[PDB]
Design a protein around this nucleic acid. Sequence first.
DNA 1: TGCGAAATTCCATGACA
DNA 2: ATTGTCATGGAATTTCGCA
DNA 3: TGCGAAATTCCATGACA
DNA 4: ATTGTCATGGAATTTCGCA
Lengths: 181, 181, 368, 368
Amino acid sequence: DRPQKPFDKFFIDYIGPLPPSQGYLYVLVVVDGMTGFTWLYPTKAPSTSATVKSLNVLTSIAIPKVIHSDQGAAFTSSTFAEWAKERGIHLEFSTPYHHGKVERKNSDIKRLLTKLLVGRPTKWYDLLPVVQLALNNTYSPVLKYTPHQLLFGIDSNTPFANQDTLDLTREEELSLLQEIR
Amino acid sequence: DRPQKPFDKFFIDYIGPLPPSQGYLYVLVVVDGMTGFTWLYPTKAPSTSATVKSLNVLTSIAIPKVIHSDQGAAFTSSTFAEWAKERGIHLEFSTPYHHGKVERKNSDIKRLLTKLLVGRPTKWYDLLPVVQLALNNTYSPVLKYTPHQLLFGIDSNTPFANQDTLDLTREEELSLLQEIR
Amino acid sequence: LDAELDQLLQGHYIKGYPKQYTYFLEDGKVKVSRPEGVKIIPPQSDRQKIVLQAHNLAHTGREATLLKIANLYWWPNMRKDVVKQLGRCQQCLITNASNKASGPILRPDRPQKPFDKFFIDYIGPLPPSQGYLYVLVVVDGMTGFTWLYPTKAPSTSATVKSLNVLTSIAIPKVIHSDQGAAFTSSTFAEWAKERGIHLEFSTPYHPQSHGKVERKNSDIKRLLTKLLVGRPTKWYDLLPVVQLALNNTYSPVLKYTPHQLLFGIDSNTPFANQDTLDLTREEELSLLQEIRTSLYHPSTPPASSRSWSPVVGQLVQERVARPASLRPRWHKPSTVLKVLNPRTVVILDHLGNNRTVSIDNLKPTSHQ
Amino acid sequence: LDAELDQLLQGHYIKGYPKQYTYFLEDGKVKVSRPEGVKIIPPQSDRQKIVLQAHNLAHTGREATLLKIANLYWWPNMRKDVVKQLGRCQQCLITNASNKASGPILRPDRPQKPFDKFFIDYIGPLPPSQGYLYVLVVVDGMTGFTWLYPTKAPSTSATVKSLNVLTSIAIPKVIHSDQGAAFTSSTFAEWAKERGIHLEFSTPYHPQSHGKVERKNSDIKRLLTKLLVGRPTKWYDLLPVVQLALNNTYSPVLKYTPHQLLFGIDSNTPFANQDTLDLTREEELSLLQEIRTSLYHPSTPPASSRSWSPVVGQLVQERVARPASLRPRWHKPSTVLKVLNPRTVVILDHLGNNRTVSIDNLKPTSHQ
DNA sequence: TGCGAAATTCCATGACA
DNA sequence: ATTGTCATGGAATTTCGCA
DNA sequence: TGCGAAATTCCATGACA
DNA sequence: ATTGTCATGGAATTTCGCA
Ligand SMILES: C[C@@H]1CCO[C@H]2Cn3cc(C(=O)NCc4ccc(F)cc4F)c(=O)c(O)c3C(=O)N12
Ligand SMILES: C[C@@H]1CCO[C@H]2Cn3cc(C(=O)NCc4ccc(F)cc4F)c(=O)c(O)c3C(=O)N12
Ligand SMILES: [Mg+2]
Ligand SMILES: [Mg+2]
Ligand SMILES: [Mg+2]
Ligand SMILES: [Mg+2]
Ligand SMILES: [N+]
Ligand SMILES: [N+]
Ligand SMILES: [Zn+2]
Ligand SMILES: [Zn+2]
């Protein structure tokens, strides 16, 4: 059986609703399986349309052999099925309601997002670029390499050499418990 | 003493008033002495200004060493004197009131003009080009050559091989004696 | 078809498939172990579609197309199938650039006499000067002697007005020009018939064909520019000066000014040449005739290493004249009916009209 | 003066005036019987004025000027006096064309890594498509991998918007461009400082300097043209397709697609290359590093027979960028302060500002 | 029958929408 | 069923002045 | 150890405002 | 105080298939 490769499998999911930012509410999350390289796309809704629109951008850079997702409506619609078939992409769903490199990455994203939207729940749209750079230049303990390094075969010009706290501070836990009020 | 040449001497004179044609009344006559080549210019008046204006056209093709004229006002004005001095042209006047190649040419012009302005005393402006071609491709009995041939050293593409009547017919003498009525 | 590829699997020999290679079935497909790896041999009936798919990704040429196909496939003589499709892709044909140069320029004989041939053309539009915007330029073929007429438009009428004044002097056998609206109108045609003047037209969009006047245009603008340095561009009053100045300037290669070639003696202009002072006019015109016939004539240059010359029956394509944004620069293929000279041809255009056309506005259609 | 010319008449020898020739007074002027005829030797104090008069008739160069003078005059070393005036005629200097070619092009090293250097530029304006008129083109220096962004204007803002989306992927060391208003604004400068990005600018009006992107512009337009044949020019929806199609096309000389140079493995696009199926990613990235460093690099071509290369302290002239009708194509002479490389120089312009300038926008001032 | 320097000729370069 | 041209200024080559 | 033909590489040409 | 580039398709050159 052949070794795992970038473009072999893309893992997609939605995160949100979030607080409105430039009129956007969700984030389509794409993680390459082999490299853990992440791509993020702001959307107005978790719909087939917003998904197709966002993936068209990504799939004009690189096309995955397989897309993996949960059984979200957006992803199980017959529109989205057609879209994938047109591009020779195989669709793959995890069973309803039911650990790995990908799974950990999605955790980081949720956590990293939550950290930066404190005091500024509205400015997340502008931070998406840096969120991704951070995520993609984050050292992986399993492999000795960042997603950048594995995707491009080189060091990057933005090494995030500070392995950041990623934890909520005392002022921010009190800020998050006051944000919901 | 050196042989005579084209551009050696230009002979100028006015003919008119004529009947108005495109608003023009006179004709400035220029004949090169050596070749008998003729140039004609329609003017509105026999003035220094109309002369300068017309000769500027000609003198942007070829400049005479000497201009010869009678003592017309146009030609003896100090404006016209200045104009000539600027171009290194020497001015030359025949004595007041007082035979040759030039003299015969001026005769032809008056005669040829008179012939063609019968029945059309108003259309002379448009005929000036052809008047000149005729005059300049007219065989000279003294030299064996036309003015064209002597100026350019070649046959022309408009030989007027018909040595034309130049005389007034019976219908035209009766037309000229009825034109003055 | 499965016909050919069947014999292959049971180890028999087919022309074009080398025998020293192991051909086998797998996944429902004939395959082969070639040095670079294992490739699928598709059935002959599938090949055209494959070549096409590969080509259509980015409408790529021979190599870039083959490199895609070779990734998954092998069959005999692949490039032949590639070239076959390249030759049938209308889109590529009308859009791609040529990579063959035109054959070397002709240097046609100088007209033998003054007034044999005039070249005419317009310069402009120029900054308004006294309401005038254009200049009519008239160059005598043999002498280079030039006449300049300021106009308001590049119209037939202004053309006729200026030439009436010029042809007062002499009438030319031929007037040569480009296909500007001024020169191709019927009013202008009649004006020339009326005077026994033959209109000659350059092949379309090829100003080299009347290079004499185009070239005089450069000198006219260059002297106007110098004279106008640090002043406003009032050029109208300078035309006369420019005409006289240029007509009396030496061409270093010829050793004569155009005035001299026309008249055989300088007029009263500065630094007039005096060499013929002691000759008679007739001895002067005799020296002039000799001088006129022995003028330097340039030779046709060497061909560039990759030039093409037209052949009767060749598919060739005419350059689109004024192509819109994002539209092909070439017309559809057309056939060479006649080779007038090695730089000029008559083509049948597919409408089909006969067109006479410069080789410089042509490319030979690729892939036969 | 009459000093020199006096000794001459009474038969004594002066340097430069050959002794075997008869010099005599006549009409109040020193003369001489030379093979071509009798010429006036003017006094040294008159000569400059004469050379000038002759030159000014039509602002002619060396020979055409001399041929006028030689008609009436002779003195020793005439062309030296001619050349002296040619070198001082501001009008000729700023108007005449050059006849020396630029020295041969540099082929600078390919950037070593992806993201080391981006080249960017705008195409447009194009036929309106969905309200969009321009395309931002971004070419990775090392890989050739290109990104395309439709815009409404070639503004700094639309530039920033597009690049924010791109630099989500990776941040480049350098961004190289022409001096378009988009790239030279301070808003754009701050945007780059903010991210540790160094802005590099091509010397003005020299698109060769960022030839990589200019050249990708051609392919972008060429594929857009083919795709749009026989349809209306709705290009906006095609940008994505063009990007993907071009990033996955082979360069026949390199034997790789830019996608391959960037990622070292094809994604799920037609005719994906399978050669590295049995390698690990790490063995793949190892082969990629080797492949990247051994890519074909073109050599600097031979000089043309009449080229010039800049020297420090040379008088040179910069090409006027957008010259008005009937105005000189060259600025006044300026001095080369520094030769950065044989194709690039810093000049002091006579204002005088320091300017860094391509040799292609320069001519060496004639006549020293 | 040969030298140094001047004169002349060669000719690549660019430019006429 | 028509067609490149020529000023320009360094460099190459020739001619001149003298012996 | 050399042939004919196919494959690959060379590279002038033109074009990106 | 910076710098041309590369798809293209015939032709030239090399390699392949076979003996
Ligand atoms: C509307 C008419 C009808 C048809 O063509 C157009 C466009 N045109 C274009 C050029 C031109 O491109 N000149 C530059 C040039 C290029 C190459 C060369 F070898 C010599 C050169 F002078 C003209 O000179 C010109 O007169 C016209 C013109 O009159 N028209
Ligand atoms: C207003 C900005 C600021 C300054 O310059 C202008 C004009 N410009 C001109 C060209 C151009 O002439 N391209 C043709 C080309 C010519 C030669 C070559 F080797 C490569 C080539 F692509 C451009 O490409 C371009 O981008 C611009 C541009 O942006 N601007
Ligand atoms: Mg024209
Ligand atoms: Mg023209
Ligand atoms: Mg630009
Ligand atoms: Mg550009
Ligand atoms: N000819
Ligand atoms: N370099
Ligand atoms: Zn195609
Ligand atoms: Zn000058």
